[PDB]
Design a protein around this ligand. Structure first.
Ligand SMILES: Nc1ncnc2c1ncn2[C@@H]1O[C@H](COP(=O)(O)OP(=O)(O)NP(=O)(O)O)[C@@H](O)[C@H]1O
Ligand SMILES: Nc1ncnc2c1ncn2[C@@H]1O[C@H](COP(=O)(O)OP(=O)(O)NP(=O)(O)O)[C@@H](O)[C@H]1O
Ligand SMILES: [Mg+2]
Ligand SMILES: [Mg+2]
Ligand SMILES: [Zn+2]
Ligand SMILES: [Zn+2]
Lengths: 508, 504
């Protein structure tokens, strides 16, 4: 019985240390968005309340209507590392167990979660302010659990509950049970979570680190974005537009839906190369081996159903001797924006590396001058880093970049636009100037010419199904729905999903 | 703290799975090893031998060790090694490179599955076996860590709870690479003096094929990356020898990799005509004033609560030193100098508190395609006020001000390039006379005799001692060298005066 031996413990100072992993504040917000997606939410409203007695001047909130949490799972939010998302496929982007505790502490000094599922209402006040102003070097976290209907306390230790509520009212932005209950009433259904991040991080001058008073329908970097600055890295709107490859959720920033785009959909002539990534053909067999000797580890762990779960994964990995034997590289020229190009790397639909030049693009010149690329890497070929902006395997990451470079060269010599004349190709679609970053011309005819090539896609708002309209609106674009769809067949909401056919090219 | 008995409220806890999550921060294995090297430097050690054993029954085939003769640790301080976040290295002038409290626990788990510390200070012998293997083979989830504390003279147990001691020794003998007590004591004898650490990292990570991630059977005097040498790869990012050569800006310690001293170099002086530019970063005095506004203020906050007192006096001591930090920090020092021996190895070599954090960072005209500033190198020692390091200590966690500094360095690099007047009189002719006579910019220098001498005349040659660790400037053998070879060990320290160029 290892009951007396020393145990590794956390401390107050570790929270800032954990926060330092995020050198990209949009990256920090992406963790809280990922948690919402993993909760199966269909709305992640990011409205920013305005409380001027808190550092920064405003509060950043995060509503949702996923599954929420219950007492045990909520308590397991302060159980650093513990993540039950380790399971077959099941996108569930979180695997490590510190994305909330690393994103909420890079944004503001404190953070107060509100959640409610089934018949429970749970608050998870974690505030560094408490620790600073009362000397606690551990990480103490109140956790009251009111009941959904009667809104009466539900816990065993009444003095614990009283103390918990006392801190929650004397430190949090809300100073009484009435206000806290009002916050709970902002989750209308019987499932959701309202993560709030009060006192914020101040830039040196004094203004907050997130700007909401320049473009009110947007969250932009408080630093004056100096030229350059590929549009995702200066606006949370643009970043969240391509923060997923398979968007089945709606992101209303400041009560305004983000025009989600699926990159690969909106491109000039796409060509989907099914590379086995040669290595990954081996690490399809070693993935079969990995899932074999990790299902064997699962058998060793089980020696029940978890091994059976991983055995069917192993059989599914022996099906990945077919299915994840090849990653899918989707090359397509981007006529509307030419300099916004480079590999758009996705690990399980969680865009990790962006605008990365691989192959001839590294060498200066029009060679692959505009080609975009996308690949969805599962959680077997590569894994992410702690910040989930880099991959923690340099060798095989560079292997994939080299592979993508060769296939990008093949795509370039397949489209043959250089043979027909790269200058003519880029001139006929509008770019008629010197600088390579010069934005397009408008001149009606050119807008139309660009428009014919790219097809139109628009997500619904009752079934969250994409469609293939010849026109466009929405549902900061204006509303539209499936019933209003001008189309003979794709008219109803019960109609089957449609996917674009992807023409294919072959390597070698 | 209790006050109203905060004893029932839930507390954030760690778990077994978090160790891998923490390990993931390091995407650079040399970066992982740098944490264990930094701990030794903070311990005032004058030797950080990285000899690798040959235990072949462990995964990987060998064990990676780290001996040193710094200050070691004691029972309490060693126990505070598993107190994630706790770090008493945040002190005025901060000669310690650690502030977070996470280098060992994040580097030892990127290298190998487990890690066993041995240490001995004053009259103590403390082992800190922390092995993921134990957790895996017994289902333990909260990270349990044995910690025996033998006495360093009698070699007898010194602890209260004998059952705890027996259990601790049992796991230490049943899981660690060495069984019994005699072997453990032999490991303790490897630390000869009365201060040191012998951090050991057994079972390793096994790159996919089966060979370990670290290569030690290609160049036995080097720990190379177990992977090919692609044509474009800066030497620091392939060889720990080259990485450790320029890991510090103020090397006052000897790094014997595989029982072989690393010829430590200071990039600040091994260059063609150097120029130190005294930029105030415009911001920096404003920033420096700003933290001096805060640092003094936040010093009152900790002092105000202690004003119950050791902290308050130290915060006051910090505050006067931070009042003096209204005088000392006003200008960083940008040291530009061309690198004739290797020109493709160029770019800003950023240092934060004498640790290297960013490597070969092209800024300014170098970002523009062309020979403009084609070879110029740069260095700056950023204090712990202007910028801070990231989780992995390879990026700075302030993008706005990091890019501000890079822009500033770009302008000053342009100024230096126009000041050396090398492009003014035939940059082709400059690189011609100093050896480069081929097509590619990356093509290595000429090797004919006269050109080697020509390169040699410009750059002076420095050499560290081996008794006082005092650098010398032998005017105008290589593995062992002392002061009386030039002119003596008691002689005053010598520093190269740096020519100064002014901005604007
Ligand atoms: N909006 C939410 N709805 C439901 N459960 C949630 C929500 N946010 C967080 N959780 C739970 O809290 C846990 C902790 O979240 P987080 O700190 O993001 O770690 P993770 O998501 O488990 N893994 P990672 O994202 O890799 O750190 C999650 O795994 C969920 O179990
Ligand atoms: N070789 C050593 N000699 C003496 N003390 C050591 C040594 N290695 C580690 N320690 C102690 O263990 C603590 C934890 O080390 P580490 O996990 O590296 O965090 P840190 O060194 O405190 N700060 P950081 O360098 O930012 O990680 C140190 O701060 C020292 O107190
Ligand atoms: Mg998560
Ligand atoms: Mg450290
Ligand atoms: Zn619909
Ligand atoms: Zn000497």
């Amino acid at each position: 019985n290892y009951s007396s031996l020393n145990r590794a413990q956390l401390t107050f100072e570790y929270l800032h240390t954990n926060s330092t992993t995020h050198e990209f504040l949009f990256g920090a917000l992406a963790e809280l968005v990922d948690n919402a997606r993993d909760a199966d939410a269909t709305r992640i409203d990011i409205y920013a309340e305005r409380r001027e007695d808190l550092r920064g001047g405003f509060m950043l909130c995060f509503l949702d209507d996923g599954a929420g949490m219950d007492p045990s799972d909520a308590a397991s939010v302060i159980q650093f590392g513990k993540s039950a998302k380790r399971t077959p496929e099941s996108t569930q982007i979180g695997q490590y167990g510190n994305g909330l505790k690393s994103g909420s502490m890079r944004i503001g000094k404190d953070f107060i979660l509100f959640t409610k599922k089934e018949d429970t209402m749970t608050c998870l006040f974690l505030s560094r302010t408490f620790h600073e102003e009362e000397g606690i070097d551990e990480v103490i976290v109140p956790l009251p659990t009111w009941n959904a209907r009667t809104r009466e306390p539900v816990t065993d230790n009444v003095e614990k509950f009283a103390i918990e509520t006392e801190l929650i009212y004397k430190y949090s932005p809300f100073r009484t049970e009435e206000e806290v209950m009002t916050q709970f009433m902002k989750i209308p259904g019987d499932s959701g979570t309202l993560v709030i991040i009060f006192n914020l991080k101040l830039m040196d001058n004094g203004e907050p680190e997130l700007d909401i008073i320049s473009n009110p329908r947007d969250i932009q970097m408080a630093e004056t974005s100096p030229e350059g600055t590929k549009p995702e890295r200066r606006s949370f709107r643009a970043y969240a537009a391509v923060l997923y490859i398979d968007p089945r959720m709606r992101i209303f920033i400041h009560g305004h839906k983000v025009q989600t785009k699926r990159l690969s959909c909106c491109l000039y002539k796409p060509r989907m190369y099914k590379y086995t990534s040669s290595r990954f053909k081996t690490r399809a067999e070693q993935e079969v081996k990995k899932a074999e000797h990790v299902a064997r580890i699962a058998e060793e762990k089980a020696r029940r159903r978890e091994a059976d779960v991983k055995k069917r994964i192993k059989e599914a990995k022996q099906r990945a001797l077919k299915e994840p034997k090849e990653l899918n590289f989707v090359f397509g020229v981007n006529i509307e924006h030419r300099d916004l190009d480079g590999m758009f790397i996705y690990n399980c639909s969680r865009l990790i590396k962006m605008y990365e030049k691989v192959g001839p693009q590294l060498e200066g010149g029009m060679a692959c001058g505009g080609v975009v690329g996308v690949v969805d890497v599962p959680y077997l070929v590569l894994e992410p880093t702690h910040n989930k902006q880099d991959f923690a395997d340099a060798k095989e990451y560079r292997h994939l970049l080299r592979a993508m470079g060769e296939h990008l060269a093949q795509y370039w010599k397949d489209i043959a636009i250089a043979q027909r004349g790269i200058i003519k190709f880029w001139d006929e679609f509008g770019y008629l100037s010197a600088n390579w970053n010069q934005p397009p011309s408008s001149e009606l005819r050119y807008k139309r010419r660009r428009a014919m090539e790219i097809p139109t896609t628009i997500q619904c708002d009752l079934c969250l199904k994409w469609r293939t309209l010849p026109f466009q609106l929405s549902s900061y674009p204006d509303t539209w729905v499936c019933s209003m769809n001008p189309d003979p067949e794709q008219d109803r909401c019960e109609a089957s999903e449609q996917k674009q056919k992807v023409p294919l090219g072959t390597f070698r």
